[PDB]
Design a protein around this ligand. Structure first.
Ligand SMILES: O=N[O-]
Ligand SMILES: O=N[O-]
Ligand SMILES: O=N[O-]
Ligand SMILES: O=N[O-]
Ligand SMILES: O=N[O-]
Ligand SMILES: O=N[O-]
Ligand SMILES: O=N[O-]
Ligand SMILES: O=N[O-]
Ligand SMILES: O=N[O-]
Ligand SMILES: O=N[O-]
Ligand SMILES: O=N[O-]
Ligand SMILES: O=N[O-]
Ligand SMILES: O=N[O-]
Ligand SMILES: O=N[O-]
Ligand SMILES: O=N[O-]
Ligand SMILES: [Cu+2]
Ligand SMILES: [Cu+2]
Ligand SMILES: [Cu+2]
Ligand SMILES: [Cu+2]
Ligand SMILES: [Cu+2]
Ligand SMILES: [Cu+2]
Lengths: 332, 332, 332
């Protein structure tokens, strides 16, 4: 009987940050309530000023990470305000039935809906919009995110001992297919609807024009670099709703990796690079051992460095010469 | 001594259906005899009437699933009738030696041959035609299928307890590279031989024009949807002879997945999406928990919804509101 | 204290061969010293005479395999002679800190440097050049290799029993993106520097013109085929620094496969094909059971047979009719 279960309202936060949660559950099963507002908006995705009509959950690409525990209920109030122009919906890969909730959540502009589902399987999972006949266009316009369903007793290593993270970041990687004119210049439209037939042609090339983390080339750099400290245990959740990716932390490793993101399986150890298939979320646990700048990339290095799929960590603390040292610095 | 072993003749069936077999073996090792006839035929692959000269085992794309047990012998009589125009052969990834049988099975039109091999490794495996100098053209013209070598005691979960399926389907996914004129229109040829140099150029783009399940856009829809009932345990074998795929059951999961298809390994659990590398067969076990329509797709959603890699399940039975429910239906 | 550790100088060998080493360590931890000289040179990559300005470690594509044990120190003297034109460096995915050594190893022409790092994680790992702002261009010009860090007690199977290989080969697979004129002909440049803006445009297509093993179409064929004997246990290390590959031994299997190359994980068994993600090295162990010719390919068969990603094994010994036999040879 759901009516006797505690309810908790959670306020979501912008990626790459994640809302406050407990790793090990301090309550029984709950109904966890979330609200998301669909926003269609113009987004500048690169240094050159290229603009798309993005379709977002809660104003961001990716949409925010939701965090619950195994056998909680998720109750999502989904709002499509009448300033939007398109019909949207939501499919949770975490959910069982009705196309992941897609069949039940169709909202025209000016409508809302509330969906509930039981989170029966532990793991990180993609959610994405999937309206009838326009699925890839919505998804590749930025309308995806992830949800993490933690085991009730938190994460475990390959031997079953606890793994506790100190920080958690969510990296959503996005393939965009911006239409081009005859010569190769990116096209512009006043509305999302205008772009549709050009979008389909661009998608069919199977060749994205931009691949980005957190909505833009260079979004996770500078002032917006991910931070940590030597000694900290960091969990990086990474999703790709449509295309394969192969993450790599330059100067580090994936100590414990769930490449396909499902925590009932033992993690892979000591990964240099791991494959997250399109339509999946993965998670990698790392303990920092050296300070400095790290690049976190898709290790198709063309995708990383030409198309945008690169971000930075800045790590503070003490250098360990035993691990690495310059014996003779560059010289004649 | 093979001459003392029982022989059983098996009649193959058209995909997505699979011939009758026993999961747990009720006999000792057998010589299992199959016959396949090569058919070169015109196939319409999409809604627009695009026609290719397909190369098939037994008239279908994919070729039929063959089912044996570990340490049976497979004896295949392969017939290339003189109504065909090309030389064909067969390579079984299940087999050891002579290029998977490829070196021993070269049949011009009007020839036949009989190959025997011992099925020493349990798993689902691709078979495909591979004639000297024309390998990718035959394979990407539809000349591939799979074989399942069950363990003698059937399938097991990650703990080693029995897993028994109630139904089994075979989904062959096919990348086609149909040649285009200057403007983008698909070309037509009277014979397979005519298309050859145009086929090579199209292949070299590495960009397929169509990606389909069971030979055509929409082949596993409507009257041809896969069916099941709530409570049934379904095994879906999925092969891709040439290109990576990432299957996903929309509204469900892969409860137990052998993504690279080899049953001596423990399955991955609770998968949302899994990667089957080109040149591989995989298998996913699911128990249906909700009725309704499910889409089974390659979760590169451009590949799925624009290029054709989508099919349907129709599942009968009782809705479970505990798993999912609409709290407030779409409204103002 | 490093100064009390034995030092051993190792002379590297050209791929696909690997320098002499011990599988099980016969000493305590050592500082293992290597020297590599960067060579920029013209390379002919295909049968048609297509020429690139390759960037190599030690004159080869790939660079040579380095072999150490877990908790050795690697000390690399890296020389960039003044006959080169570009700045290079080295990133080891085996190493922890400073972008894998990349930040510490920047050498202009006429400079050298010596880097030391502790090999803390067992596995096969990629190394590649990665200069600031020119990373994909150097890597896809051939500037990558691998290092193997063996466990101190050698390799183990999925049950933890020893696995001993009799021979070891290193296959580096390389994606090249040679620029084309308007009509599709490959362009030529007098220097590496000339090609730069054309290289970037070619890379951005994400479509390689050639995919090769060991630097050229047909490099591991004929006189240069890999050899073995029936009964021998062979380890094939395979790396791809930038793009996914899916190796397959035609007529054989991967008995024990570490697809993502990290030996603390149990191997996958009985693989037909396995996925090595771009930015990764993998390793596959096979025992030959039949003589004859085997093809070792990327099983995107367009990549294999049209673009160059195919090599040969020639295996000597006794044919086993029990495994495979032609019952009725091709005939009317
Ligand atoms: O500004 N909305 O695309
Ligand atoms: O769009 N809210 O009713
Ligand atoms: O789905 N593309 O990797
Ligand atoms: O294939 N996706 O990088
Ligand atoms: O499902 N990946 O742990
Ligand atoms: O009709 N045979 O291509
Ligand atoms: O083609 N049958 O002999
Ligand atoms: O082999 N192409 O994914
Ligand atoms: O990369 N094959 O979808
Ligand atoms: O080989 N995959 O279970
Ligand atoms: O000959 N050096 O590119
Ligand atoms: O370039 N050697 O000093
Ligand atoms: O990274 N390309 O498979
Ligand atoms: O996707 N690389 O073959
Ligand atoms: O990390 N692969 O065994
Ligand atoms: Cu939408
Ligand atoms: Cu989906
Ligand atoms: Cu054929
Ligand atoms: Cu094959
Ligand atoms: Cu370089
Ligand atoms: Cu790297």
């Amino acid at each position: 009987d759901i009516s006797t279960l505690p309810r908790v309202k959670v306020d979501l936060v912008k990626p790459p940050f994640v809302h406050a949660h407990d790793q090990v559950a301090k309550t029984g099963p709950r109904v966890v309530e979330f609200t998301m507002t669909i926003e269609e908006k113009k987004l500048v995705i690169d240094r050159e000023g290229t603009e798309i009509h993005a379709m977002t959950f809660n104003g961001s690409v990716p949409g925010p990470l939701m965090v619950v525990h195994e056998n909680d209920y998720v109750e999502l109030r989904l709002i499509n305000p009448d300033t939007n122009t398109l019909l949207h919906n939501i499919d949770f890969h975490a959910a069982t039935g009705a196309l992941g909730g897609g069949a039940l959540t169709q909202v025209n502009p000016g409508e809302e809906t509330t969906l509930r589902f039981k989170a029966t399987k532990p793991g990180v999972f993609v959610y994405h919009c999937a309206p009838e006949g326009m699925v890839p266009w919505h998804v590749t316009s930025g309308m995806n995110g992830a949800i993490m369903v933690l085991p009730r007793d938190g994460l475990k290593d390959e031997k079953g001992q606890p793994l506790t993270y100190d920080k958690i970041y969510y990296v959503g990687e996005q393939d965009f297919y911006v239409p081009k004119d005859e010569a190769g210049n990116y096209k512009k439209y006043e509305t999302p609807g205008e772009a549709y037939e050009d979008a389909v042609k661009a998608m069919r090339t199977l060749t994205p024009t931009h691949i980005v983390f957190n909505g833009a080339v260079g979004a996770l750099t500078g002032d917006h670099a991910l931070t940590a400290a030597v000694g900290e245990r960091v969990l990086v959740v990474h999703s790709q709703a449509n295309r394969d990716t192969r993450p790599h932390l330059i100067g580090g490793h994936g100590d414990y990796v769930w490449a396909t993101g499902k925590f009932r399986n033992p993690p892979d150890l000591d990964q240099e690079t791991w494959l997250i298939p399109g339509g999946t979320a993965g998670a990698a646990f790392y303990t920092f051992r050296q300070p400095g700048v790290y690049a976190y990339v898709n290790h198709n290095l063309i995708e990383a460095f030409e198309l945008g799929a690169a971000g930075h960590f800045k790590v503070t603390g003490e250098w360990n010469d035993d691990l690495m040292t310059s014996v003779v610095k560059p010289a004649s």
